[PDB]
Design a protein around this ligand. Structure first.
Ligand SMILES: N#Cc1ccccc1O
Ligand SMILES: N#Cc1ccccc1O
Ligand SMILES: [Mn+2]
Ligand SMILES: [Zn+2]
Length: 442
């Protein structure tokens, strides 16, 4: 069925008017569009993609760290076992580290070597992919990061309407820029984004990338394929067999991203990518203030706890920041936030009361302003308000945080721990009570 190979939602920009046009924002965030390809974006803004050329990067910071993935160079859209016998989901991707200057040398000699071959089942060649390059430092990358402020507000790394701007601290690769340096065949295996946030990706060129996209609501089916093939959905590297997806009636969006094209991956959308030519890419995340985005973020946050995986985004901390600082006028979104806050409040109340009733002292610790969120030093769960710290760490003021469960596993009556309280109970109740539905006529 041609319904299993649908057309990709696309917008063709000509000029700055088209880029700043408000229905473009609304199209991208529509939950019915699992992906949007904004074609011609860089040319429309006169973005200087040369600021991200390999030549410019080498001159800017030649020793900057690059994470290298070594992979097999595979035919078209397929993934074969390394003996060339059968197509499988597991794809090998070994890790090491190099510098921008060393990868640059490989990328250039890779192309020259391919030129010479042009002019003059396996087995498969091996290639190297430069990934997760950290462009967070404003001093090191001044002109690069400035160029990205030319984007329309909804797609920027920082903006008033971006939930990740409201977290209150740096989450590397989410509210900072990541760079990728590629050769043909360089593959990003199947995944969803961290805590299901949207992603923005611009191809620097000169070569193309090819993208595969599956809607969020089919993720359970892909999870099943993984487990059936002895792979973890969240932790392992997998490359879907398209004939398996087709036979299971999963629709796959498939398209080419050319230099200057911006790809918007909507919340929770499952995707994997390969370079067709030689190119660089930049990417980051964004969180639109919609019900769909809040729901899918919370859902992945909770799924991560069950799977013993850490959440990079502290949704409890973020939720209180939303109630404090953002006017919310969508009734469905408002009710979601209100529900989540009321649950948090009740959990906190129940724990605090059990502690007091057990004759355990709750020690006022207060909070420094603009202080970030905290996680459990053992299990890496987010920990909110009530912190559990050993007697010794308390005295030494190294205040190492534990969650309640981990402290109790180690010290059965918490006799080895102090309980620190950051937020006055009446504060939290106030913030909650103050938070009401705003009127918008839009
Ligand atoms: N090699 C290497 C490396 C790994 C993590 C962070 C910085 C590095 O230079
Ligand atoms: N419980 C516990 C514990 C473990 C290492 C050091 C100090 C402690 O209170
Ligand atoms: Mn991605
Ligand atoms: Zn813990």
């Amino acid at each position: 069925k041609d319904k299993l190979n649908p057309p990709t939602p696309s917008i063709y920009l000509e000029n700055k008017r088209d880029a700043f046009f408000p229905p473009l924002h609304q199209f991208c965030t529509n939950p019915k569009n699992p992906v949007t390809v904004i074609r011609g974006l860089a040319g429309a803004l006169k973005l200087d993609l040369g600021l991200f050329s390999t030549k410019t990067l080498v001159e800017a910071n030649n020793e900057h760290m690059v994470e290298v993935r070594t992979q097999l160079l595979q035919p078209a859209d397929e993934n074969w076992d390394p003996t060339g016998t059968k197509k499988i989901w597991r794809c090998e991707s070994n890790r090491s580290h190099t510098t921008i200057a060393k990868y640059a040398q490989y990328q250039a000699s890779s192309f020259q070597e391919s030129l010479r071959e042009e002019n003059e089942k396996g087995p498969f060649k091996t290639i190297k992919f430069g990934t997760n390059i950290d462009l967070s430092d404003n001093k090191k990358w001044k002109l690069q990061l400035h160029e990205l402020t030319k984007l329309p507000a909804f797609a920027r790394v920082v903006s008033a309407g971006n939930l990740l701007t409201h977290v209150g601290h740096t989450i590397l690769g989410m509210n900072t820029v990541q760079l990728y340096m590629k050769v043909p065949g360089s593959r990003t295996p199947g995944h969803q984004e961290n805590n299901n946030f949207c992603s923005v990706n611009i191809n620097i060129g000169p070569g193309d990338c090819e993208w595969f996209v599956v809607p969020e609501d089919y993720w359970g089916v892909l999870n099943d394929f993984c487990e059936k093939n002895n792979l973890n959905f969240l932790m392992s590297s997998w490359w879907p067999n398209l004939e398996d997806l087709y036979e299971a009636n999963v629709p796959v969006y498939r398209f080419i991203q050319r230099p200057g094209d911006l790809v918007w991956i909507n919340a929770g959308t499952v995707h994997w990518v390969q370079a067709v030519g030689w190119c660089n890419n930049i990417a980051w995340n964004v969180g639109p203030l919609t019900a769909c985005q809040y729901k899918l973020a919370v859902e992945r946050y909770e799924w991560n706890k069950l799977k013993s995986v850490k959440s990079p985004v502290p949704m409890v901390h973020l939720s209180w920041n939303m109630a404090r600082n953002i006017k919310v006028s969508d009734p469905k979104l408002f009710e979601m936030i209100k529900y989540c806050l009321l649950k948090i409040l009740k959990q906190y109340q129940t724990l605090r009361e059990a502690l007091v009733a057990a004759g355990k002292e709750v020690i006022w610790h207060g909070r420094t302003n603009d202080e970030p969120a905290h996680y459990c030093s053992i299990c890496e769960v987010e920990v909110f308000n009530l912190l559990f710290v050993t007697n010794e760490s308390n005295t030494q003021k190294t205040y190492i945080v534990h969650c309640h469960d981990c402290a109790r596993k180690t010290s059965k009556s918490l006799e080895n721990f102090v309980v620190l309280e950051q937020y006055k109970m009446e504060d939290l109740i106030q913030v909650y009570d103050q938070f009401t539905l705003a009127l918008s006529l839009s």
